Design a protein around this ligand. Structure first.
Ligand SMILES: Nc1nc2c(ncn2[C@@H]2O[C@H](COP(=O)(O)OP(=O)(O)OP(=O)(O)O)[C@@H](O)[C@H]2O)c(=O)[nH]1
Ligand SMILES: Nc1nc2c(ncn2[C@@H]2O[C@H](COP(=O)(O)OP(=O)(O)OP(=O)(O)O)[C@@H](O)[C@H]2O)c(=O)[nH]1
Ligand SMILES: [Mg+2]
Ligand SMILES: [Mg+2]
Lengths: 89, 1103, 184, 431
């Protein structure tokens, strides 16, 4: 309701680059996957075409559901608060 | 083929103990096993050699003394699956059958609960296993409650259940009581119990019906697998008790079936391998033969056949007579089917006497063509199948010397049924019967010739059975007249138009082999049958008369003769009173008359192609009046059969005008020509759309000699009628048909220099291309939808229809600017989003670019287009699929010429409404831009053309919102990174100015959101552009729609979290805290202070 | 219900075939059955019950039912006369002290009503044993010419070498296939 | 008193039919024996529409169980509510089409349709005011879909002035592994676009995704997908088996939800997504349910109603809620100025309330729409069908058995025309 009841606090990981630490970011719930991909591209300086995002909730360890469709939102994939976001390139 | 799932199934069976622990993996394994074992449900014999070890892996676990309940339950389920896949009769023989497996399986069955619908399979297969173990030669006394008592109790407990265990219990009872030591001990008690249960159960009670079914099945199995010298004493009382059960007068099919089975087993037992009680069973079976169900009649026929196979000759003759008596006209189709089944069962064993052949054969003549229209659909398919089965059995029933006289009544009956029927099963049965008769007796004429052509696969296709196979079989004299007679006395009088048309085409194809018979004995009947009360008959009587006339005209044309060489003065006289005797009987009135509208029309074209001697008679005037009335009253016809009737009328009118309307070679009667065109063009302004379309199509189908001296008038009329007038804005079909007629005229008149008012030349082609280009641009919309597209396609087909004409004759008339505009329009159409229209435009472009006879002059970028569209990648490229069309069409943007229209057409699919199309278009655009993302010239030109397209398409919502969405998607990807370097970029200031006026005062949440997203994405450009974007965002934040406010706040937060250089370090945190602690969907009074504080923090002016 | 469903069932029933090989003990039933399929014949114990053997020959899926020849079992052979198309009778040639008995059991089997319609096949076993009455001598001791209601054809064989076994198999498969098209 | 004759075809069809029958029997006060043990008068009001009164006041399902394999029939007969069914309505063979539509429409289908029509007529005779037929099958095999299309064509030649409902289930490469599946999902459409009035599409890819993401299940099974199909079927037939302000039976529902003769593919949904295990869940509210039912995550089809124009929409509520509240919430939802304003919700949206709620839940809502987004599903099959039709690899099995290239070309043309009409109506606007 205050624009702070929608933001999902997710921790980002980098399996490819293990030297990097962990960063926990609050992203809007209705934020499309395309916007998150563009943000990650502008941050890590990696092109958007070479990016693969996945979400993994803590309730189901070991699972890794891919995010293919870029037009959908994070809420469509049942992304709850406190889910890990893996990025591969 | 072989068992490929050998190792897989072995591993699946081995991995069992470590699966039953849970529930998910167990269900997965069960589903996998079922899917693997169901593949051999059609060819189960493949599992024969692989069924010995599999069972060995499923039973040893059941006999283990340390196995849990779930494991044995899963094993029993797998065993039941294997048994219901292969067959218990062929699978129980491999089970243990020693005397040490009788107490481990009988006592094991006493550990199951009959009220457990979860583990029920275990209670089924085990009864079968007990029946298997009961086959040992040893006695039960040496092994000793006793075992026989427990077995009887278990059987009398599962026989009264509504689960699948009833069949297993009945099988066990049948295999147990029929033993040496069990017959003289436990048999009368079970019989008395069954009699009491039958005299204590009902058909209305759900439990009573189940008990009756169970006891009847048990009795039937006992009498089948029982002795003849032991069951006869009790058979009398069994039949006496069954007679009172009132099974025939019950509302259950299974009960009646079991009763018929039990009464035919009793009858068989009464006889030896006539006493009292046989007549009772005979009459009961004769009465039951007239059932509604198919299983009851089949069982009754089987029982009657089995009884006749053991009775004297007089009894067999009486049974045959009683069966034949069930064929009178007063009977029903069920009685006929039962009689046919009984006759087949009797002939299968060879019991019928030759003296009956004089009658039975006749019954077949009326059985192989049983067709009684019962309301909507007709009946008689099962009757035809039974007749075919009887004919097949006749191959072995009688001898050839006895059937000799009936070799043309059975070989011609089989030929007519296996080629001119409506069901494929009946045709296949007839073909099989014919093959069996040819293989056994071999007396039919040309049996091998009919078997080679009419094969098991060729007979499946019905359309081929009425053309290729029909003519091949009728080529012989023995199948020339009967086939046509049957087609005229049956197939033509059908209740389906498709069947009537098929029969008419078959008669047309067959007339070429017998011109005399099809013009002396077939024409007189069909000519008089056109005056019957029935509509379909008259419709099949007009079609048959039109096909024979066409065939006779063609046959004559071979000898340079007329069609009157075959038709006498009485034929042509009666063919001229067809349109007159309908108009007189107002037959064309009503929906029934619409059939006569499609009939007489077919009679006008055919007769118009034979050059009949009707020139200068009232029949031509009558046909013209009928055609005009049919073309004018088109709105009174259903939309389903609206195009077919219109096309038929247009073809008939064209044929009439080309044949009859012709004074001298290359000329026409001035009077009739002036009379036609007058009304033809006057009706083009008819407020009705259907009439306008019909008259336009009629004008477009006129020949060339009639358009001499009056082509300019028709041209200007068709040009003025195809316009988006203020009174006819939603007239899409009218313009479509007008363009179609214009194209047809341009194609039929050809080209001829120095002749504007006769053919196409340099004085009207410029007015033809202008009208085509004007009609091309059409994006009308109404409640129905985007119907304008229906016209756009019709324009494309026209632009080509003319381009290939002038290119083949006087190519110099084709200008350069006109061809360039046509190519640009074709590219724009191919860049559309619809699949069908996109594929059509792509095909038109490929045909226009890959014409070489001569090639078409003035094609912008011919070499580049040919290189980007190879000749081999034409049929394989699926233009209908966006994936196989967008990456192949986006390459046209590289060409300067194909950059404006291509981009304008691509903007609608990039910002469209479909998720798959938008994704593919965006991917193609990104792949195309990745190659021109370095050189600033390409990006600058792209930005310039995009701004021009957006500025020439402002407030056209059709293109503003798609263009805004495309801009947002491109900015989200970041294709203008080099432009972000300098401040106040030209494409970054022009677009901002355009977007503000575009959404300015917008009451659409669709274009408002796009503008908000564009403004949020445009913040990357530093300078005054970012300040203006922030000011506009802060201004629109105070909209009157809470949804707009909250979406704008979310987008602002997103673009702020994305770009970090938009706000300082000690200001960004405060801005984020303010945005996180504010309600952007509540009363604007409190939101005003937050907006003011945000503007003061970010430096945005305070309006 | 038509030819597409009835013919599919008749072709399968004709392929399958059943053969009940009866006889007294010590005759050579189990040994001959094992030799037919080609297995060991060095250890054969008395069959205290009944066994079934599925074989494939010339496409004819046969199911041989071998029942023990003990006297106690003679009172239970009636449970194997269901759908019996043939009856194989093994007669011991090297034992004249019990040939007459073999005739008795051969006279009651033909009288059975369920065994009717089948074909009889007599096999004189132990013809490699000195003192083994020939097939001509056995043709009269068992009274073969007296039979008329059913077909028959004596043919001596041997369970050791395994000769004259398959030759008689073809004659048996041909006689049943000759009447399989039409029974009457 | 409009009666409805239920028919089942194929393994999945029979399974979903039995599941729906059991669910409704567990919600209308009917016990397995077939005796009514209820505590209300809202159950035995429209019970004659799904049951027949027999001796002793017993209610009997009017379902005809047809197949070509006996395993599923025996499993359904020996289930919880198996004895309640009529053993005289169990039609089944021993072979099966074999995943081939030609063998299930011509080879074996015609041999058993002759007997199935007898039972169909017997069941339709007891119906006083016959309303039509409702088949339940799939579109990924030869037996099920073939027999379904055959029966529909037969019911369109014997019962032309009758309603024809088809709760087809579209397959998914995720659930099945056969390569000819696209074919079974193509020709059937020809029969389901020309011989049908309503077609409730049930995608097997959307249900699998919902079970893998929402339910967070390790390995979703056919019992988890049959729990969802049964819930959707029970929610769709709410107004048909219970009274209310929305008295739209089979025919009236088709007259109020079929705005076009050819376009009639719906997209049912269900906001309270309950798993096959437990069913206890907080009692949602009216606005929360209205907002969660319109979400694409709570849809049974793999289509986004947002990406397309809406044709007809209907919402049926079943809980301790008011119809006045349902109408105040709907009026607020369709107002931009209001804070409760949302998109993808036009003004043509009916409303209904059910006094008797679904089992396990106290407040539920079921949405039935007809947006053009369903076209996105059809195209998903086109790319999987034509890609093989151009090669004619497995086309021999159909040609040599009965079919022909003409039928395939006609079906492809019909599918293309349907897709074109859908894409054209997607941009339908009038002022
Ligand atoms: N010399 C010789 N011995 C044989 C021949 N055939 C069988 N035998 C032996 O005869 C004995 C009895 O053979 P089986 O096959 O066990 O007897 P059976 O007739 O089946 O007898 P039952 O077990 O009572 O049914 C065994 O020692 C066999 O090896 C043969 O051709 N020659
Ligand atoms: N949702 C769902 N789909 C099922 C179920 N069982 C089978 N299917 C699907 O049904 C489709 C076709 O298989 P079935 O319906 O079992 O086949 P059939 O109709 O009996 O046909 P034949 O295999 O030819 O006998 C496949 O796509 C399966 O995934 C089920 O319980 N639920
Ligand atoms: Mg032995
Ligand atoms: Mg199946």
């Amino acid at each position: 309701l205050m624009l702070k009841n929608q933001l999902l606090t997710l921790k980002i990981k980098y399996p490819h680059q293990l030297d990097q630490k962990v960063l926990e970011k609050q992203l809007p719930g209705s934020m499309t996957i395309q916007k998150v991909k563009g943000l990650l591209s502008r941050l890590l300086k990696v092109p958007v075409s070479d990016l693969l995002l996945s979400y993994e909730s803590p309730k189901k360890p070991g699972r890794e559901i891919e995010l293919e469709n870029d037009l959908k939102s994070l809420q469509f994939y049942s992304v709850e608060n406190g889910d890990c976001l893996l990025v591969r390139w | 083929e072989a068992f490929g799932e050998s190792a897989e199934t072995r591993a699946l069976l081995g991995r069992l103990r470590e699966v039953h622990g849970g529930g998910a993996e167990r269900e997965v394994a069960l589903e996998r096993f079922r899917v693997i074992m169901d593949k051999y449900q059609e060819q189960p014999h493949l599992l024969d050699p692989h069924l010995e070890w599999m069972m060995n892996l499923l039973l040893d676990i059941v006999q283990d003394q340390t196995s849990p309940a779930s494991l044995v339950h899963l094993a029993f389920k797998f065993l039941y699956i294997i048994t219901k896949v292969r067959g218990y009769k062929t699978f129980l023989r491999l089970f243990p059958h020693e005397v040490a497996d009788v107490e481990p399986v009988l006592d094991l069955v006493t550990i199951q609960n009959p009220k457990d619908h979860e583990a029920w399979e275990t209670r089924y297969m085990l009864l079968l296993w007990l029946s298997v173990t009961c086959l040992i030669p040893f006695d039960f006394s040496r092994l000793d409650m006793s075992i026989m008592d427990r077995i009887l109790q278990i059987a009398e407990s599962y026989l009264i259940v509504s689960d699948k265990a009833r069949d297993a219990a009945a099988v066990l009872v049948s295999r147990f009581i029929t033993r040496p030591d069990v017959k003289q001990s436990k048999m009368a008690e079970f019989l008395d119990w069954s009699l009491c249960n039958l005299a204590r159960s009902s058909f209305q009670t759900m439990q009573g019906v189940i008990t009756m079914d169970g006891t009847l099945q048990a009795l039937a199995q006992i009498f089948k697998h029982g002795k003849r010298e032991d069951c006869l004493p009790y058979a009398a009382t069994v039949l006496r008790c069954l007679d009172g059960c009132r099974l025939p007068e019950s509302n259950q099919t299974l009960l009646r079936k079991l009763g018929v089975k039990l009464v035919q087993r009793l009858g068989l037992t009464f006889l030896k391998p006539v006493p009292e009680g046989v007549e009772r069973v005979i009459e009961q079976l004769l009465v039951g033969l007239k059932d509604k169900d198919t299983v009851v009649r089949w069982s009754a026929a089987k029982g009657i056949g089995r009884m006749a196979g053991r009775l004297p000759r007089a009894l067999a003759d009486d049974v045959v007579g009683s069966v034949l008596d069930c064929f009178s006209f007063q009977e029903t189709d069920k009685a006929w089917h039962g009689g046919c089944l009984a006759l087949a069962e009797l002939g299968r064993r060879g019991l019928l006497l030759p003296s009956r052949l004089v009658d039975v054969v006749a019954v077949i003549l009326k059985a192989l063509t049983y067709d009684e229209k019962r309301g909507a659909c007709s009946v008689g398919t099962n009757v035809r199948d039974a007749a075919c089965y009887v004919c097949w059995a006749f191959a072995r029933a009688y001898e050839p010397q006895e059937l000799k006289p009936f070799v043309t009544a059975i070989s011609s009956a089989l030929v007519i049924a296996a080629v001119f029927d409506r069901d494929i099963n009946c045709r296949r049965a007839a073909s099989a019967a014919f093959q069996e008769n040819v293989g056994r007796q071999g007396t039919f004429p040309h049996g091998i010739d009919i078997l080679t052509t009419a094969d098991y696969f060729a007979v499946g296709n019905r359309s081929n059975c009425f053309l290729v196979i029909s003519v091949f079989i009728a080529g012989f004299p023995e199948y020339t007249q009967p086939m046509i007679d049957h087609l005229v006395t049956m197939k033509i009088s059908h209740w389906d138009g498709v069947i009537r048309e098929l029969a008419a085409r078959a008669l047309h194809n067959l007339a070429q082999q017998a011109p005399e018979f099809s013009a002396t004995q077939v024409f007189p009947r069909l000519l008089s049958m056109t005056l019957s009360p029935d509509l379909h008959m008259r419709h099949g009587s007009i079609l048959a008369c039109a096909e024979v006339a066409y065939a006779l005209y063609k046959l004559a044309a071979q000898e340079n003769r007329p069609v009157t060489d075959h038709l006498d003065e009485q034929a042509v006289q009666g063919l001229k009173q067809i349109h007159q005797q309908l108009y007189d009987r107002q037959l064309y009135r009503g929906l029934g008359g619409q059939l006569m509208r499609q009939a007489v029309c077919v009679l006008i074209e055919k007769l118009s192609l034979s050059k009949m001697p009707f020139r200068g008679d009232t029949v031509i005037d009558g046909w013209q009046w009928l055609i005009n009335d049919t073309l004018r009253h088109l709105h009174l016809i259903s939309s389903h059969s609206r195009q077919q009737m219109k096309d038929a009328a247009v073809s008939a009118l064209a044929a009439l005008c080309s044949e009859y309307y012709m004074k001298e070679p290359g000329e026409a009667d001035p009077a009739i020509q002036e009379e036609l065109i007058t009304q033809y063009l006057a009706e083009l302004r008819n407020p009705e759309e259907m009439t306008r379309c019909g008259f336009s199509l009629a004008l477009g189908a006129l020949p060339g000699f009639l358009l001499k001296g009056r082509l300019q008038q028709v041209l200007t009329g068709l040009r003025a009628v195809t316009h988006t007038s203020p009174e006819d804005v939603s007239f899409a079909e009218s313009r479509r048909d007008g363009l179609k007629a214009i194209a047809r005229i341009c194609q039929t008149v050809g080209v001829k220099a120095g002749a504007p008012d006769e053919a196409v030349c340099g004085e009207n082609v410029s007015q033809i291309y202008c009208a085509l280009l004007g009609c091309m641009d059409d994006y009308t919309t109404d409640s129905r939808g985007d119907v304008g597209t229906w016209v756009r396609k019709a324009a494309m087909t026209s632009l080509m229809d003319l381009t290939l004409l002038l290119a083949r004759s006087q190519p110099e008339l084709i200008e350069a600017h006109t061809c360039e505009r046509i190519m640009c329009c074709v590219a724009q159409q191919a860049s559309e989003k619809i699949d069908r229209f996109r594929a059509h435009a792509a095909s038109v472009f490929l045909t226009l670019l890959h014409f070489d006879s001569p090639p078409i002059p003035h094609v912008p970028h011919r070499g580049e287009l040919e290189k980007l569209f190879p000749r081999s990648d034409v049929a394989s490229v699926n233009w209908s699929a966006p994936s196989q069309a967008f990456p192949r069409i986006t390459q046209l943007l590289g060409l300067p010429t194909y950059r404006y229209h291509v981009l304008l057409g691509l903007v609608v699919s990039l910002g469209g409404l479909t998720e798959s199309t938008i994704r593919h278009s965006t991917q193609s655009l990104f792949e195309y831009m990745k190659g021109i993302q370095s050189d600033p010239q390409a990006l600058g030109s792209f930005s310039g053309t995009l701004l021009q397209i957006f500025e020439d398409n402002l407030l056209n919502e059709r293109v503003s919102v798609p263009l805004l969405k495309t801009l947002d998607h491109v900015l989200t990807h970041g294709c203008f990174d080099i432009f972000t370097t300098e401040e106040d970029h030209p494409f970054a200031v022009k677009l901002l100015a355009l977007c503000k006026k575009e959404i300015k005062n917008s009451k659409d949440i669709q274009k408002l959101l796009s503008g908000i997203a564009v403004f949020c994405e445009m913040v990357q450009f530093p300078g005054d552009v970012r300040r203006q974007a922030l000011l506009q965002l802060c201004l629109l934040l105070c909209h009157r729609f809470p949804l707009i406010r909250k979406t704008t706040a979310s987008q602002v937060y997103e673009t702020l979290l994305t770009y970090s250089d938009v706000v300082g370090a000690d200001v960004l945190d405060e801005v984020v805290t303010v945005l996180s602690d504010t309600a952007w969907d509540a009363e604007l009074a409190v939101v005003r202070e937050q907006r003011n504080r945000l503007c003061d923090l970010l430096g945005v002016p305070r309006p | 219900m038509g030819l597409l469903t009835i013919l599919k069932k008749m072709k399968q029933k004709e392929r399958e075939l059943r053969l009940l090989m009866l006889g007294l003990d010590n005759a050579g039933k189990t040994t001959i059955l094992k030799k037919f399929n080609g297995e060991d014949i060095d250890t054969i114990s008395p069959t205290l019950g009944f066994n079934i053997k599925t074989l494939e020959h010339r496409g004819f899926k046969l199911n041989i039912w071998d029942v023990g020849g003990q006297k106690s079992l003679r009172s239970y052979w009636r449970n194997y006369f269901e759908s019996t198309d043939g009856l194989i009778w093994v007669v011991d040639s090297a034992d004249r002290q019990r040939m007459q008995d073999c005739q008795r059991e051969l006279q009651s089997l033909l009288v059975e009503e369920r065994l009717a319609g089948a074909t009889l096949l007599i096999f004189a076993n132990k013809q490699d044993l000195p003192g083994a009455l020939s097939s001509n001598a056995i043709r009269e001791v068992l009274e073969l010419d007296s039979i008329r209601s059913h077909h028959w054809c004596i043919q001596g064989c041997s369970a050791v070498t395994g000769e004259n076994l398959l030759p008689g198999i073809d004659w048996l498969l041909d006689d049943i296939s000759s009447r399989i098209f039409t029974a009457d | 008193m409009r009666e409805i004759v239920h028919i089942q075809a194929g393994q999945c069809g029979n399974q979903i039919g039995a599941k729906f029958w059991e669910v409704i029997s567990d919600e209308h006060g009917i016990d397995p024996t077939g005796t009514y043990h209820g505590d209300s008068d809202l159950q035995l009001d429209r019970i004659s529409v799904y049951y027949n009164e027999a001796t002793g006041g017993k209610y009997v399902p009017r379902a005809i169980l047809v197949d070509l394999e006996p395993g599923t029939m025996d499993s359904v007969r020996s289930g919880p509510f198996g004895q309640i069914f009529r053993p005289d309505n169990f039609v089944f063979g021993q072979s099966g089409a074999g995943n081939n539509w030609a063998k299930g429409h011509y080879t074996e289908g015609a041999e058993l349709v002759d007997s199935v029509l007898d039972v169909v007529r017997k069941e339709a005779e007891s119906c006083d005011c016959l309303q039509g037929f409702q088949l339940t099958h799939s579109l990924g095999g030869g037996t099920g879909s073939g027999m379904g299309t055959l029966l529909i064509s037969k019911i369109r030649e014997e019962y032309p002035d009758r309603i024809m409902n088809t709760f087809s289930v579209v397959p998914s490469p995720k659930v099945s592994d056969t390569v000819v599946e696209p074919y079974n999902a193509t020709l059937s459409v020809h029969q389901l676009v020309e011989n049908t009035d309503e077609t409730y599409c049930i995608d097997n890819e959307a249900l699998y995704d919902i079970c893998f993401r929402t339910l967070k299940l390790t390995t979703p099974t056919y019992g988890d997908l049959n729990h969802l199909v049964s819930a959707t079927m029970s929610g769709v037939t709410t107004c048909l088996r219970f009274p209310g302000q929305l008295n739209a039976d089979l025919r009236k529902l088709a007259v109020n939800m079929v705005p076009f003769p050819r376009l009639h593919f719906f997209m049912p949904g269900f906001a309270p997504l309950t798993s096959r295990g437990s069913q206890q869940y907080r009692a949602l509210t009216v606005p929360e349910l209205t907002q969660q039912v319109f979400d694409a995550k709570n849809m049974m089809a793999a289509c986004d109603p947002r990406h397309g124009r809406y044709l007809t929409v209907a919402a049926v509520f079943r809980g301790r809620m008011s119809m006045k509240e349902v109408d105040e919430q709907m009026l607020n939802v369709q107002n931009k100025n209001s804070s409760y304003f949302v998109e993808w919700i036009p003004n043509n949206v009916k409303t209904a309330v059910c006094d008797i709620p679904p089992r396990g839940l106290k407040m539920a809502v079921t949405f039935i729409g007809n947006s053009t987004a369903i076209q996105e599903l059809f195209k998903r099959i086109s790319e999987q069908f034509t890609a093989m039709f151009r090669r004619k690899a497995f086309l021999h099995w159909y040609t040599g058995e009965g079919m022909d290239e003409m039928e395939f070309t006609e079906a492809e043309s019909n599918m293309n025309d349907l897709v074109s009409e859908y894409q054209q109506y997607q941009d339908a606007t009038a002022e």
